[PDB]
Amino acid sequence: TATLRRLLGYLRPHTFTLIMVFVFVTVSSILGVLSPYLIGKTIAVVFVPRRFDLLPRYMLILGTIYALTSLLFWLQGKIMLTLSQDVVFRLRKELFEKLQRVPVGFFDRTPHGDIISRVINDVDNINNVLGNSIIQFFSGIVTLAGAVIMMFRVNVILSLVTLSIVPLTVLITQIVSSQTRKYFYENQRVLGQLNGIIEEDISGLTVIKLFTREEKEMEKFDRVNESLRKVGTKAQIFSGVLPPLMNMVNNLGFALISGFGGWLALKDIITVGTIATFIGYSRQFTRPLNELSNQFNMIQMALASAERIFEILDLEEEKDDPDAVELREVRGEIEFKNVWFSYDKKKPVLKDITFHIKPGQKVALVGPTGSGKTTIVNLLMRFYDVDRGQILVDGIDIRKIKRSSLRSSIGIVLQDTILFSTTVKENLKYGNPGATDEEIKEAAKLTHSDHFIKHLPEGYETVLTDNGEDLSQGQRQLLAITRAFLANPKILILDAATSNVDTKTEKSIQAAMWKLMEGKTSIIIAHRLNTIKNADLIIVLRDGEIVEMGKHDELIQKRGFYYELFTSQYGLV
Amino acid sequence: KTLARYLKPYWIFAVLAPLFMVVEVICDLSQPTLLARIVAEGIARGDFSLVLKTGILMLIVALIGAVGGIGCTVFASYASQNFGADLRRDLFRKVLSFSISNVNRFHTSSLITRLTNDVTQLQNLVMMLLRIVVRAPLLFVGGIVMAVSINVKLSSVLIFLIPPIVLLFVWLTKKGNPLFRKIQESTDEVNRVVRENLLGVRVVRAFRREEYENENFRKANESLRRSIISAFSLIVFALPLFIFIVNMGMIAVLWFGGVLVRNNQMEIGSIMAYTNYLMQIMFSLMMIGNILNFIVRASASAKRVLEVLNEKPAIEEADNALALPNVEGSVSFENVEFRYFENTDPVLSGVNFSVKPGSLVAVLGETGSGKSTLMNLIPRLIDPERGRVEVDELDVRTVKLKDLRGHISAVPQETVLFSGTIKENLKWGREDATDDEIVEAAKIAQIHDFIISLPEGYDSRVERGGRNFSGGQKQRLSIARALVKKPKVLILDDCTSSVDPITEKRILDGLKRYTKGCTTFIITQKIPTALLADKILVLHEGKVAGFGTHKELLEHCKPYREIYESQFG
């Protein structure tokens, strides 16, 4: 009910163009009722006078009528095709742009395949409602109103018999249309489910072949595919069950016309001529009634898909504070105030996180697996917000500053390297689009990235594969390091920056890397403790609490956890 | 042509679907004339004995067509859906057999559209055909025969009406097919644009280039809507032309009809019958023209489906291959040379070294040496151009793929976990592995400490990509998963890159203890973790640098000294 009003709600600015569609469809329908009648009426004035008296004169009249009607149906289809695709385009655009506003906390939990299906399949599914189902509806309502007036002109009493079956006609349609939409919605969610396994398995097939999960992922697919088959048949059957079921109601209707025209035919009233004529008038009324009842059932297919489209449009998106402040004259002051954060909100991940970082400081966040180092970084990037605590970037709180200006001041190098499927040049150009080739090539030469780019088939213009897996795992890291160093932020995050990069090449950057790192605040995460030892402040993390703090030399003689961490690198005791 | 093989097992439902349509067309066309025969006898005789008796008979005929109508839908929907459902499972099986290269030939974003949309286009074709597969020819062949007795010498006009109608759909096939293919090609772009923002939303938000991707989507969305209107314009342009030939056909009937009155060949009321037959011929002609429009959309989608099925995988199992029930672990390389692209320089070349079974081997080198690439030759993930790989002093190609891969376990450089739970993810190596077995492997990989400290233990939800955990935890899980499989040949591509130095020690010493008869290989970047191995292997630029003890490589092997220098001085 509500979804239908919202679906047709996208046709609201198109109303001015839609009025013309109603005009052109009515003119072509009136010409489509007169033309088969005129050929049967003028034929009587052909057999009686004969010769070339009236035979070639009527051909020029009919020739212009048939040409005007043929041009009318073409004009109707041409203007509707443009309008149909523009409603589809706007619906597709409104979905992708909603995803860019939606928080990260949706992407990780929901399957990727179902999202793609909701744009590629579900919006291609609402093509059966636009154009074809619109022209036919407006043609359907004019022929129904055009025939009901003809029936009342013949007999008012006999028209009420054909009108008493109309509430029962709407009754059967509403029972079918409710089930048709019910099965078609289930068909689309299982399609998105199947789309989930397709996307997931393809993007990670190398892992599947390695652990020989070929039949296991096949049975995981077949469990959803056989379920899609069982709902698919139910959707298709219910879609095409209304036309033959309505043909039964028509045949039962004509059986009652001959039935009542038998008992009443015994008396002086009701003639043989009156029954045969009223059948012809009821036929011109049943035909649009069958079509309008079927179209309402055929649009349920689109209604079920549009229902999945509005679910994404109803999702709660990222919202900034009304008094959003744009951070001007960024220095690099970072401060945490008794921060407590949990992802599942049940098991607290960060238990009391508090530290002060002055601008232009190299901070080395260190600690064991699953401590909360990446969590402190993610909260700073405002991907997630603190339950009870404060993050003050350059004096102002993280909540008051808009996400748009907060991310403008901070550049990142993620733990799990992600790369776009464009040219190497366009991938490094992310974060700073104003970067010239003189900037790009000099930066890449300093981070040892340019060493392997000049060996590629198209060089800097080599179009990368999805996630850039056509390169070595360390090679990808060096690309992400440059990307952020080109973006030139006042605050930089080097979360697991040189994990897959070798110890020898990592040192070769270090000197040139720090030259670009000076005059900026940088939080570096690494388990290569002997590289991050020269940082201005070292924050040792454990379970999600700050255990040891200060400079390297001070923490070594302390013989605490940092000493236990550092000595563990070298297995020589 | 090969697409029919999937409709072949469901031929019982495929042959009964048009059979019910014949029952339907008879019970709908003959019933109004049969009902009139009851009316005709109702005025001739009347009474309760003739009107009421035929009143029961007319209800029966109405029920036959009703069951015949709904019966046509059921027999066709079951056949159309089962065609698509069996087509998808045969395509997914072929995509599962594909090698990393075959998944990159067709784009990852295109394969999704092929396995879903391109199946649906063919699925709708079977549905559209089955309904008017017997309705279209029987109303055309049976339609002209009824008109043949009415018109004399007007047969030549009917034969001349065939070529302009044939040209109307032949032009729609010539220009249609490449344009309808451009629609399915443009969907692959909006599929890629959405997947790019989905896999790595954190990268888009960090650099605020959300508007850039919004513009990137608008550039591809406009590309799709314009690709649709370009192919669909052919259908719009064919409408005034096809309708005009029907009007021109009626003009030919009226012109030649008046001549027949002068010659006295057709009666005064014979024009009523021929105008009714002319409508049945044109309506049946429109029925062929409608399914042919679905054919051009389906043919463009058929090519995309068939090319995935006919695509030979880069890694194939030999017909006369001998299955290996037991693997000792005798790893050996004989002048192995591999290249990814013909235009580029060789990745690996002149690699020849023998590996003892059970012994731990440390593999070190610079970024872009070929450590991961060489380790991919062992479970047959890549085939070399020159030279051969030998497992148990026998070629890898001669051994069955499913048997060979079952004995070799690996820990990839980029750890990727899948949907389900920790237990559901760990059971990838061996689904037959009982709770007692999977726990001991997790006690080696230190991950068991944390596994139990979750809301449901091993049954704690793991989301696509493992993204619902910490970097090192994904890595810690990945180690235990390879140990679960119980191998005789083990590969550890940067095993503890995202793990602390304390846990790092605990994992390595936990491995040696449980690898007493397993050819273990560890791609390491650290010198103190490389000493734990029996024979240390060195790789640089592509060729093999040195194979021997730590005392030998410091004086003989040149690149080894360079990596060692960055760690000690």
Epitope: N530, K533, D553, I556, L572 | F568, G569
Partner: nanobody, 115 residues
Framework: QGQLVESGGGLVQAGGSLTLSCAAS????????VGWFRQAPGKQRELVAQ???????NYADSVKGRFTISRDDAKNTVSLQMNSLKPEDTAVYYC?????????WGQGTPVTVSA
Amino acid sequence: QGQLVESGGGLVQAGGSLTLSCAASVRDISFFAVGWFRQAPGKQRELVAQMTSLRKINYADSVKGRFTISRDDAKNTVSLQMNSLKPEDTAVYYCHASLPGLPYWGQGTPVTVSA
């Protein structure tokens, strides 16, 4: 962990010779650099002999040529041979263990040059 044991020292005549042994217990020298320092009453801890794991020796220009360093990899001990002792050598000699930012110092061997 780390532990350093110093052997030798005592008193010796001017322009003579002496051997200073630095034993490293519960530690393997083969990976970290070896060092030698000295502290005279009113003088800073000035470097004597520094040798990295890759064999690269850097003696101080004021004690250069005269002093010779030795590292026995199978024994796990670092020796410092003294030749022609001057009155400047009258200081408590210390041994040094390197490792990347993780050092350990010696106890101090007594050296007194008589004139």
